[PDB]
Design a protein around this ligand. Structure first.
Ligand SMILES: [Ca+2]
Lengths: 274, 54, 18, 339, 232, 51
């Protein structure tokens, strides 16, 4: 009976978030491949992000099913019948997270190429390179998901998974801030007044805040669990693990609203779906 | 001048035609439609096998 | 690896010998 | 003498309209009331001819009712085998901006034209392959809006310059020039018997011409803004006008009046292409609102709607046997429909 | 699976022509397409001639990026119903005879038609105010007064942001910028941010016209994509 | 009995009374820091656009 009980969230919240994410990323995927108009590389990178989100929410659904199976006893409380299942499902989880991060990164890179290599973009980002880069990233994602779920609780594994957050975040910043500065340069020539733009700053803030608020809590929890399980304050932070998971899952729900639907063509594709 | 002349002749030749009553024209159009009311693939779809796209 | 937990890295790994 | 000439023109105009009213006995609407409806006629995309890199602007079925041609604004004239979806050919056109394409009834030649004022005849069966331009029918002073073959040696073209012309392919000169339109002529439809052809133009009028005689027999009006499309009824007694202002209207030659005006309150788009199904009861109409409407040609009601294109449908070729309706679109896709 | 020799050959030709279509697709996607609209007086001919280095198409590569350019000469005076097909060009190049004072209002009406078109609502316009040398010559000497055609020039000063080319007196700058902002007024009035105008002072002999086109296309695509990303 | 039994350790029973700073020090500090980072990004981007 400690002052920081391990907060247990109702299974309803997990189920609802996972179902919403699966459905939403499903309509995002359907908008592509049912609208051959939407077949540019950028929409394929958005589709990769949607697949990552779908895999994460699907992981959740499977993990809840397996937990409510162990509970109620349909599966043995321990043994290969549960430990290897946990390994494989949490592998799905880790590869979903890494795919999401690298999908955000490649979306940023594609946007950077479109802006700062506009006249030569289609020569640089072709469908061949689209497929090859997506395949390489997802192969890396699955391989290191296996690596980080089987060789999980070692310190260097935590170090690398942790570091993929700040380093990719600074990459995304270096890209988006440069695009924002170019937009400022254009705003100088568009109109005479200073006219400090808001939709650019608001857009970058929304993107980066969704990325951070939906990853920083989990990364902090992992770091504190690895380097400092003993400090009382730490332990009170770790008590909120399920909330931080919910946050690392809200990304799936709130990713399409910030990368997919803000394209008018994708909105139109969804409208015709209806 | 010449353009006006040509316009006048064109109007005259257009007028000279032997117009027919609308009732007869509509009757002919309806009769033609009836004569193929079941021979149009799109008006009445054929069995899937006979459809050359199947 | 040693139990089904809702995510990975939920708790540390030590020697719970008994 | 302009005053007297215009007075005479107005007098004859009054005469023609009065005669039209005299023959305006009970309209097609009440007569077609006795006709039963066709129901909610429908059809599903049986094929999606992909391969064009840009907007599809024109198509034409060959008389085989199997092979079709389509022109995209890159300058590619792909000949498609509708049954198997195989691409028999794709001709690299010298001018990227094509606005029309035609298939010879014999299937031996395919013609096209566009913002370049040249009708390019391409011979499909020669040199054991390697389709190459047969003759560049140049001489028009505007963009070729439509092309249609009479026979393997004759082709009739409509151009932005307010004129249509007949060209003998071998001799490569205008055997006849159909001057008389007040605006750009956009589409022309040959009658089932090739003696006549009807062309609609931007002057908000449609005109019927004798190919041999070389002068206009009749002119029609009532459609408001423009005629993007024009098609003959399968019999050759009436032709439907696809207007740029929300209305598709059917005109009869011998009666020479607007037999009907197909339109609905909801639709505001302009008609881009119009064609009849065999037996003519079904007047397929393409719209700017990325949809194709099915109109009962007689009872004048929307018997169906086709919706599979993400953009403006530009061409609405119907097969000679009546077993398919092909729909090109600016979305680069060419979909074949059948009940 | 079970195909006749004829069917096998048919699908083989389909695959070959699909390969050729894919090659044409890369050629087409990486080439930027321009419409060179302009009045007869406007030196469209001079522009195309300098960058040689019915519809008339001129190829030119600047910094290893392909550019179409479709002159639309030998066409009726009215432009509608063939401008609808140029709805997907990256930019429109509008050349105007700045020197010819009388027809300048007709040029403004033409630019109004092109700018405020139902189509072309997402296409930028590059105003190559051609033959500024002739305008300079005419505005130095008398016998041609702006007010006689555009009375507003009496009440017009030189924009504070004007950057006159060295070796030009104040009055030529006044007149040239008056014409520029006369076009821009009808340009900025209904921009809606979807498409922008890129004024440029140019002459016939100028070899930098292609470079201006390249920079303008860069800016147009950049601005369009930034708007798509909501960064601008 | 058991020996060298590697397993998921449970959370230490932290008692707030012994703690000097508030139990949730890390949570509040980290979330205030994240909100501050987001607001700083917004304000710096706005200033760069303005300047
Ligand atoms: Ca787990």
């Amino acid at each position: 009976n400690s002052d920081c009980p391990r907060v247990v969230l109702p299974e309803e919240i997990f189920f609802t978030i996972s179902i919403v994410g699966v459905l939403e990323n499903l309509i995002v995927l359907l908008a592509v491949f049912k609208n051959k108009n939407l077949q540019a590389p950028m929409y394929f990178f958005i589709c990769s992000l949607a697949i990552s989100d779908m895999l994460g929410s699907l992981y959740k659904i499977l993990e809840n099913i397996l937990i409510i199976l162990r509970n109620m006893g349909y599966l043995k409380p321990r043994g290969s019948f549960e430990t290897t299942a946990d390994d494989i499902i949490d592998s799905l989880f880790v590869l979903s997270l890494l795919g999401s991060i690298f999908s955000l990164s490649v979306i940023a890179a594609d946007r950077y190429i479109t802006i700062f290599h506009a006249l030569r973009y289609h020569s640089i980002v072709t469908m061949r390179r689209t497929v090859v880069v997506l395949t390489v990233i997802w192969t890396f994602c699955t391989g290191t998901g296996i690596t980080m779920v089987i060789f999980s609780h070692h310190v260097p594994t935590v170090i690398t998974f942790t570091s993929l957050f700040p380093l990719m975040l600074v990459f995304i910043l270096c890209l988006y801030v440069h695009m924002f500065l170019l937009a400022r340069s254009h705003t100088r020539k568009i109109s005479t007044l200073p006219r400090a733009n808001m939709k650019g700053a608001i857009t970058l803030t929304i993107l980066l805040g969704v990325f951070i608020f939906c990853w920083a809590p989990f990364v902090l929890h992992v770091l504190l669990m690895t380097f400092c399980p003993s400090n009382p304050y730490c332990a009170c932070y770790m008590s909120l693990f399920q909330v931080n998971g919910m946050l690392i899952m809200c990304n799936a729900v709130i990713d399409p609203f910030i990368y997919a639907f803000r394209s008018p063509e994708l909105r139109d594709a969804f409208k015709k779906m209806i | 001048i010449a353009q006006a002349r040509k316009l006048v002749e064109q109007l005259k030749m257009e007028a000279n035609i032997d117009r027919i009553k609308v009732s007869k024209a509509a009757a002919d159009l309806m009769a033609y439609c009836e004569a193929h009311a079941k021979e149009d693939p799109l008006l009445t779809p054929v069995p899937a096998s006979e459809n050359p796209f199947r | 690896s040693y139990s089904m937990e809702h995510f990975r890295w939920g708790k540390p790994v030590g020697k719970k010998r008994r | 003498e302009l005053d007297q000439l215009r007075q005479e023109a107005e007098q004859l105009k009054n005469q023609i309209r009065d005669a039209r009213k005299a023959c305006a006995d009970a309209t097609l609407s009440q007569i077609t009331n006795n006709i039963d409806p066709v129901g909610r006629i429908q059809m599903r995309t049986r094929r999606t001819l992909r391969g064009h890199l840009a907007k599809i602007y024109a198509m034409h079925w060959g008389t085989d009712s199997r092979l079709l041609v389509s022109a995209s604004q890159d300058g590619k004239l792909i000949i498609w085998d509708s049954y198997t979806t195989n691409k028999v050919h794709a001709i690299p056109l010298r001018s990227s901006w094509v606005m029309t394409c035609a298939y010879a009834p014999s299937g031996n030649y395919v013609a096209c034209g566009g913002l370049d004022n040249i009708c390019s005849i391409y011979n499909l069966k020669t040199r054991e392959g390697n389709v190459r331009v047969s003759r560049e029918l140049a001489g028009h002073t505007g963009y070729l809006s439509c092309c249609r073959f009479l026979d393997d040696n004759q082709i009739v073209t409509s151009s932005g310059d307010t004129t249509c012309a007949l060209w003998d392919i071998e001799t490569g000169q205008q055997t006849t020039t159909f001057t008389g339109h007040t605006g750009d002529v956009m589409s022309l439809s040959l009658a089932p018997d090739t003696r006549l052809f009807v062309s609609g133009a931007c002057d908000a009028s449609a005109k019927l011409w004798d190919v041999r005689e070389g002068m206009c027999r009749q002119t029609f009006t009532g459609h408001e803004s423009d005629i993007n499309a024009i098609c003959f009824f399968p019999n050759g007694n009436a032709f439907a006008t696809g207007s740029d202002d929300a209305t598709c209207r059917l005109f009869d030659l011998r009666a020479d009046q607007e037999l009907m005006t197909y339109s609905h309150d909801n639709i505001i788009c302009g008609i881009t292409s119009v064609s009849f199904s065999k037996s003519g009861r079904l007047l397929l109409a393409g719209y700017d609102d990325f949809n194709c409407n099915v109109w009962d040609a007689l009872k004048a009601d929307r018997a169906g709607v086709l919706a599979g294109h993400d953009n403006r449908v530009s061409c609405l070729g119907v097969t000679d046997d009546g077993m398919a309706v092909a729909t090109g679109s600016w979305d680069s896709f060419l979909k074949i429909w059948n009940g | 699976c079970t195909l006749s020799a004829e069917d096998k050959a048919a699908v083989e030709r389909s695959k070959m022509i699909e390969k050729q279509l894919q090659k044409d697709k890369q050629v087409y996607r990486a080439t930027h397409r321009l419409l060179l609209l302009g009045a007869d007086n406007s030196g469209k001919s001079t522009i195309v001639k300098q960058m040689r280095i019915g519809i008339f198409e001129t190829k030119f590569q600047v910094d290893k990026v392909n550019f179409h350019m479709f002159d639309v000469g030998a066409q009726r005076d009215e432009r509608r119903k063939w401008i609808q097909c140029f709805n997907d060009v990256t930019a429109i190049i509008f050349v105007v005879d700045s020197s010819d004072y009388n027809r300048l209002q007709e040029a403004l009406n033409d630019f109004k038609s092109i700018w405020n078109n139902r189509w072309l609502r997402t296409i930028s316009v590059i105003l190559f105010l051609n033959k500024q040398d002739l305008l300079a010559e005419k505005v130095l000497a008398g016998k041609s007064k702006i007010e006689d055609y555009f009375p507003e020039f009496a009440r017009y000063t030189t924009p504070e942001d004007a950057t006159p080319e060295p070796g030009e007196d104040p009055r030529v700058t006044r007149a040239k910028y008056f014409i520029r902002d006369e076009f821009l007024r009808i340009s900025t009035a209904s921009g809606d941010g979807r498409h922008y105008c890129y004024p440029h002072f140019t002459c016939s002999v100028d070899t930098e016209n292609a470079r201006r086109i390249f920079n303008d296309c860069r800016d147009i695509i950049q601005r369009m994509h930034l708007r798509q990303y909501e960064l601008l | 009995s058991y020996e060298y039994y590697l397993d998921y350790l449970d959370l230490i029973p932290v008692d707030e009374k012994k703690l000097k700073a508030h139990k949730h020090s890390i949570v509040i500090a980290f979330w205030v820091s994240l909100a501050a980072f987001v607001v700083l990004l917004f304000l710096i981007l706005l200033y760069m656009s303005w300047s």
